[PDB]
PDB file of C-alpha atoms in Angstrom:
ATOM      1  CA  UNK A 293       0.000   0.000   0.000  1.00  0.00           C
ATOM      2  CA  UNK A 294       1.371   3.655  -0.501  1.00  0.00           C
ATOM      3  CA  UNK A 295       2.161   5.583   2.820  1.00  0.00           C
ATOM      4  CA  UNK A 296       0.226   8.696   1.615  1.00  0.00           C
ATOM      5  CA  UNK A 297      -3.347   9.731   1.111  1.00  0.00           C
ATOM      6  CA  UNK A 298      -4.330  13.173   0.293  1.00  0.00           C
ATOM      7  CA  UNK A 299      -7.937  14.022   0.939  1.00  0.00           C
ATOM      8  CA  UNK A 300      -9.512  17.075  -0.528  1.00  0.00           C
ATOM      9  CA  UNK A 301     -12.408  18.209   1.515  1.00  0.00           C
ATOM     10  CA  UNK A 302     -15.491  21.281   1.284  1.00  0.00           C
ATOM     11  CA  UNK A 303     -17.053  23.204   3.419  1.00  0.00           C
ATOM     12  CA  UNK A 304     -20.103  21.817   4.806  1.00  0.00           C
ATOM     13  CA  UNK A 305     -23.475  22.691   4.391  1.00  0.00           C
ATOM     14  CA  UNK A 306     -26.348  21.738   6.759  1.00  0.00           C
ATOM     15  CA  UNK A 307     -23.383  19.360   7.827  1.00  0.00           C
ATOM     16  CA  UNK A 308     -23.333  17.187   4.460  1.00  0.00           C
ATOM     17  CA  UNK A 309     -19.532  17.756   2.797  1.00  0.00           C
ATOM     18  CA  UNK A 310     -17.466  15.852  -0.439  1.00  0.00           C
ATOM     19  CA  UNK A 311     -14.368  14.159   0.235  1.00  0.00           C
ATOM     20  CA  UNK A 312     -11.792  13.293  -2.726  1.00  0.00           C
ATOM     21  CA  UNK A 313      -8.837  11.020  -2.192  1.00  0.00           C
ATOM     22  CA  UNK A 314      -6.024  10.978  -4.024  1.00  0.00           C
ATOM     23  CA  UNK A 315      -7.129  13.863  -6.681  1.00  0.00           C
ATOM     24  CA  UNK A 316      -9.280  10.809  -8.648  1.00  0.00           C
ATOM     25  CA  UNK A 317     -11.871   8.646  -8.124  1.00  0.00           C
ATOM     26  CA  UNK A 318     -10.135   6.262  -5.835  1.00  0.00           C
ATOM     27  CA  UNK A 319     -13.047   5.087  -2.971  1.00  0.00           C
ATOM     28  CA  UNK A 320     -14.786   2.161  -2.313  1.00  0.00           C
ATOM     29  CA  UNK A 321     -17.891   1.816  -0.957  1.00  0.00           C
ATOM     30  CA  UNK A 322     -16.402   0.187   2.439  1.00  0.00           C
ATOM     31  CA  UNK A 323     -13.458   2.432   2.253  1.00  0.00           C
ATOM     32  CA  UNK A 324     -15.809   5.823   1.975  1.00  0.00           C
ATOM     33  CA  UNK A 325     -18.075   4.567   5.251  1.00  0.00           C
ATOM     34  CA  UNK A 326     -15.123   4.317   7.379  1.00  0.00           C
ATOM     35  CA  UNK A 327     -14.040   7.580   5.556  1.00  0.00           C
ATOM     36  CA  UNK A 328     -16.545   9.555   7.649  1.00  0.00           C
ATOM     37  CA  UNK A 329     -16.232   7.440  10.686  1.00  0.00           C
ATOM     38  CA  UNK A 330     -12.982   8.680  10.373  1.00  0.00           C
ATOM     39  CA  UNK A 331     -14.497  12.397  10.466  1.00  0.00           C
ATOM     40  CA  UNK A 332     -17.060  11.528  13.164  1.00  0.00           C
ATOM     41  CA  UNK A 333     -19.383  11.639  10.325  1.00  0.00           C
ATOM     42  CA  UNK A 334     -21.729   9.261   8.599  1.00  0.00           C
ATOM     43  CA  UNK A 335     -22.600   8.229   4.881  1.00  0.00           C
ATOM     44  CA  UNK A 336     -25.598  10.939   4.278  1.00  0.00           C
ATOM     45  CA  UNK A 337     -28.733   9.790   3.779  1.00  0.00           C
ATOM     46  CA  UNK A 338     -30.478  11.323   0.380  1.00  0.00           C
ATOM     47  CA  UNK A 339     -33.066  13.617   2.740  1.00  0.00           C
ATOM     48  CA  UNK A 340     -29.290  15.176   4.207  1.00  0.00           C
ATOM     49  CA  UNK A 341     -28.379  15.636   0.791  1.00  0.00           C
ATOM     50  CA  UNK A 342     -31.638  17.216   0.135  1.00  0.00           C
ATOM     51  CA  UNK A 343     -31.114  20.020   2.406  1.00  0.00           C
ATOM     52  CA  UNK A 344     -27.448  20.422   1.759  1.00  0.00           C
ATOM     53  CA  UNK A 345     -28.409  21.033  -2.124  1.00  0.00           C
ATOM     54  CA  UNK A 346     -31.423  23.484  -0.969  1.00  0.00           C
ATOM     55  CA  UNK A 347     -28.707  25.941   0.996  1.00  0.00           C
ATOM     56  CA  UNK A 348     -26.156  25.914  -1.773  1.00  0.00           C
ATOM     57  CA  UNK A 349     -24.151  22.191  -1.765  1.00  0.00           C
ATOM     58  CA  UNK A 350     -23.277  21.410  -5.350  1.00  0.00           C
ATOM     59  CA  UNK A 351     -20.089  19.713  -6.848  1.00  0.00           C
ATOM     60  CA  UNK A 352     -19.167  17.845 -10.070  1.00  0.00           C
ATOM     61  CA  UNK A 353     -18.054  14.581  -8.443  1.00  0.00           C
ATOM     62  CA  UNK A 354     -19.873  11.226  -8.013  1.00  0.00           C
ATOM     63  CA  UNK A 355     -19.927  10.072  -4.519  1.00  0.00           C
ATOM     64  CA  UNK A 356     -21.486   7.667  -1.873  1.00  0.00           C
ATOM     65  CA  UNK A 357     -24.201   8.674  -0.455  1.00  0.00           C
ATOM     66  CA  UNK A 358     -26.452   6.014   2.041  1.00  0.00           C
ATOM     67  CA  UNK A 359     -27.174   3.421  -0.388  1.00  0.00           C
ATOM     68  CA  UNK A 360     -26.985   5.250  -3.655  1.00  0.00           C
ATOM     69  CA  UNK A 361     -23.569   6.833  -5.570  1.00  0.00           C
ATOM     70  CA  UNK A 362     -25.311  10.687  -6.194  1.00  0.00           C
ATOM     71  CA  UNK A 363     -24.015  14.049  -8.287  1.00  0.00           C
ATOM     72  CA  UNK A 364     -25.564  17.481  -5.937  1.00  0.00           C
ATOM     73  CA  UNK A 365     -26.480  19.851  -9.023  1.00  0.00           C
ATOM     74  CA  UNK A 366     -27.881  22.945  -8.684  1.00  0.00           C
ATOM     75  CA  UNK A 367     -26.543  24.857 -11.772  1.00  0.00           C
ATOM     76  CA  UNK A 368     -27.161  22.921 -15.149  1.00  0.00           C
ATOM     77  CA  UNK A 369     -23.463  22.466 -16.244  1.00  0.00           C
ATOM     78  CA  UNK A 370     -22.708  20.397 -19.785  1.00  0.00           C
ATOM     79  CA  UNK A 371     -20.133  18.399 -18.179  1.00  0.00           C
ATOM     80  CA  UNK A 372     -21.861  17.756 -14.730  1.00  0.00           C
ATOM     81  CA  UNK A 373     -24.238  14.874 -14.846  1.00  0.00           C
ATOM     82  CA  UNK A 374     -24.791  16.122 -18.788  1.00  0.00           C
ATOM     83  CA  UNK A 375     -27.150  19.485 -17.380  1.00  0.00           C
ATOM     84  CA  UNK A 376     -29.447  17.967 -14.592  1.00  0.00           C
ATOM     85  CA  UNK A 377     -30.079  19.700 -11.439  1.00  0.00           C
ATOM     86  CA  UNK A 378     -31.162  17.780  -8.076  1.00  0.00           C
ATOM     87  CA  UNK A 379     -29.614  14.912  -6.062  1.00  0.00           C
ATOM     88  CA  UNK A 380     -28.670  12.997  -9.062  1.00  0.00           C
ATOM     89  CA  UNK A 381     -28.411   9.060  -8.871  1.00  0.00           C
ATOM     90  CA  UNK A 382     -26.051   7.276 -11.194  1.00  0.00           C
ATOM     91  CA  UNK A 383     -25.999   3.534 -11.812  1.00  0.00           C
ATOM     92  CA  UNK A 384     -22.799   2.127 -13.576  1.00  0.00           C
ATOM     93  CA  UNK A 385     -20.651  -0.990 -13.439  1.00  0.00           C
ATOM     94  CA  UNK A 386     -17.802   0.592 -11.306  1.00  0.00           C
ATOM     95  CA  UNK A 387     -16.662   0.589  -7.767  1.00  0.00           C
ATOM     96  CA  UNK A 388     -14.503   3.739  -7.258  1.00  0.00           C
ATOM     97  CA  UNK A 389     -16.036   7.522  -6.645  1.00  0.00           C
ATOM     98  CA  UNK A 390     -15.296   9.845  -4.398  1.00  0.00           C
ATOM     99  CA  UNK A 391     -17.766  10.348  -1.172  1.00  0.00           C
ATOM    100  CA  UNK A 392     -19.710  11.914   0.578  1.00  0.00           C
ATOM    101  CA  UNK A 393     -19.855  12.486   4.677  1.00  0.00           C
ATOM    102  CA  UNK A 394     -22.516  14.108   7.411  1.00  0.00           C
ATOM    103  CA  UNK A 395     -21.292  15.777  10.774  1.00  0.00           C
ATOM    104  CA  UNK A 396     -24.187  15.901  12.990  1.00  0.00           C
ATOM    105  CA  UNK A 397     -22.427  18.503  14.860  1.00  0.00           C
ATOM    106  CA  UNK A 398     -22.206  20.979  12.195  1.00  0.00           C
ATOM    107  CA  UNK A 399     -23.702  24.056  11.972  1.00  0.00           C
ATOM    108  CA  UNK A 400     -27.200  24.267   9.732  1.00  0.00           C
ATOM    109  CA  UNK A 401     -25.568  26.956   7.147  1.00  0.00           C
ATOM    110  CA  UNK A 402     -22.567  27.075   5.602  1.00  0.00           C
ATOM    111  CA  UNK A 403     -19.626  25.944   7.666  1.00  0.00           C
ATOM    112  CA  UNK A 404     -15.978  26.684   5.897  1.00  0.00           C
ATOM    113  CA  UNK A 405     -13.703  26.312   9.332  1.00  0.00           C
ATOM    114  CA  UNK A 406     -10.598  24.749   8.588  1.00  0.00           C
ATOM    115  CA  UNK A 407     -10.949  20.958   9.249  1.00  0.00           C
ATOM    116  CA  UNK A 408      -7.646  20.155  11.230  1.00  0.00           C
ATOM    117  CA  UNK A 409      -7.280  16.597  11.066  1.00  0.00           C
ATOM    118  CA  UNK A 410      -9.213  13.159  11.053  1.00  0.00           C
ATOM    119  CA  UNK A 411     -10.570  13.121  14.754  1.00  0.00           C
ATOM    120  CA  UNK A 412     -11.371   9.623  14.689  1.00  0.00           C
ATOM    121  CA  UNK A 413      -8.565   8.196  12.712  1.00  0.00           C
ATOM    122  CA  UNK A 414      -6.965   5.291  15.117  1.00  0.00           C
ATOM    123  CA  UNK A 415      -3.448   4.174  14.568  1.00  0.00           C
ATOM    124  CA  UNK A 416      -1.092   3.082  11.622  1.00  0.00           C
ATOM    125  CA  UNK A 417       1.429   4.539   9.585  1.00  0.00           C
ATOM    126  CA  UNK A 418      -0.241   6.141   6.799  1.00  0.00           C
ATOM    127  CA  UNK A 419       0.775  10.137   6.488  1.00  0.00           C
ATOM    128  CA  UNK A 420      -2.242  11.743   5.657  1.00  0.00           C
ATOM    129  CA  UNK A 421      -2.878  14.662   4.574  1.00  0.00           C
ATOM    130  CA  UNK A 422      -5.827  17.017   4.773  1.00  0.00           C
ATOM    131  CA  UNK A 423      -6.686  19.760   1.912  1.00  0.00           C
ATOM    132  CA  UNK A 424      -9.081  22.427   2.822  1.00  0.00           C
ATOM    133  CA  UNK A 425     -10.948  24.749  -0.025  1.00  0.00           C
ATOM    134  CA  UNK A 426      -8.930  27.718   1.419  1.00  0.00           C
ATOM    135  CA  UNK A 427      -5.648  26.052   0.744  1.00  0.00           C
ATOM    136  CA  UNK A 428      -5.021  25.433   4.561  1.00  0.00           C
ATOM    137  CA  UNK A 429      -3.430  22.033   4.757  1.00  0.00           C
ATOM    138  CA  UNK A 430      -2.583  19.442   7.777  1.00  0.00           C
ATOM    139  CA  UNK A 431      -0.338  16.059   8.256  1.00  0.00           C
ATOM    140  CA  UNK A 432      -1.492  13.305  10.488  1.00  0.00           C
ATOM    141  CA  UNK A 433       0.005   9.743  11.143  1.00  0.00           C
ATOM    142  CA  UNK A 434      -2.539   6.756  11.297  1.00  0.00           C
ATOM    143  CA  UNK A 435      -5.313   4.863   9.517  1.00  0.00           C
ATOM    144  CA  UNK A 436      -8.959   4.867   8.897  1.00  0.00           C
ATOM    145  CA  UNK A 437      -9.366   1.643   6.560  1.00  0.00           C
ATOM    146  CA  UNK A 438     -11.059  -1.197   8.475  1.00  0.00           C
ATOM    147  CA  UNK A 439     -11.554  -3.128   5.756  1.00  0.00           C
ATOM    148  CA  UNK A 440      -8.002  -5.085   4.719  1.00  0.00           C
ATOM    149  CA  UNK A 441      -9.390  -5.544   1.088  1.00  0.00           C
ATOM    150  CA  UNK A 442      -9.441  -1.762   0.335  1.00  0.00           C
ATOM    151  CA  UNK A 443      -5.641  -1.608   1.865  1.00  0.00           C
ATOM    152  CA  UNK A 444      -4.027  -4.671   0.573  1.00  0.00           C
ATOM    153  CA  UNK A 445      -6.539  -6.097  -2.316  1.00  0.00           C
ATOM    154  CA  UNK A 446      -6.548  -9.507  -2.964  1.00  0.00           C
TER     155      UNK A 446
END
């Protein structure tokens, strides 16, 4: 396994946010729940993704929602989900997006304070590295993967 992982995060809003490792899609559907464990968060469900999208929460990235892989549009864009607006749901033949994650203890609006590390990381000897919209950037040494086939695939 490589000893890095970058992870790109937003700001939340009504406590829903979009994670990206590794600048791709590069998450597995076990790998993004333990993601947000990670951020004492949860997978959000599509009525949190709702209300994120109805305060101002859009991106162009496919990511996990609670039981669905989803596309937040609010803005008809060409080369997001092809002009749609709403919680789009996309069904493919693929494993890897990025994800999606809800902190219960955010604030309802708009919350851009600079996310510091992974709280609820445990420990291992991954260095890894959190991005923040407003270029503010931390190291941490540990893990979040509990599942052994998204760290060493078999």
């Amino acid at each position: 396994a490589m000893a890095q992982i970058d992870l790109n995060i937003t700001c939340r809003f009504a406590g829903v946010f979009h994670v990206e490792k590794n600048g791709r899609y590069s998450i597995s559907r076990t790998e993004a729940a333990d993601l947000c464990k990670a951020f004492n968060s949860t997978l959000p469900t599509m009525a949190q993704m709702e209300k994120a999208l109805s305060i101002g929460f859009e991106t162009c990235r496919y990511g996990f929602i609670e039981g669905h892989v989803v596309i937040p549009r609010i803005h008809p864009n060409s080369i997001c989900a092809a002009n749609n607006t709403g919680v789009y749901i996309l069904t493919s033949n693929t494993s890897q997006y990025d994800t999606y994650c809800f902190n219960a203890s955010a604030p309802p609006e708009e919350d851009c304070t600079s996310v510091t590390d992974l709280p609820n990381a445990f420990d291992g000897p991954i260095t890894i590295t959190i991005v923040n919209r407003d270029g503010t950037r931390y190291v941490q040494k540990g893990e979040y993967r509990t599942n052994p086939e998204d760290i060493y695939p078999s």
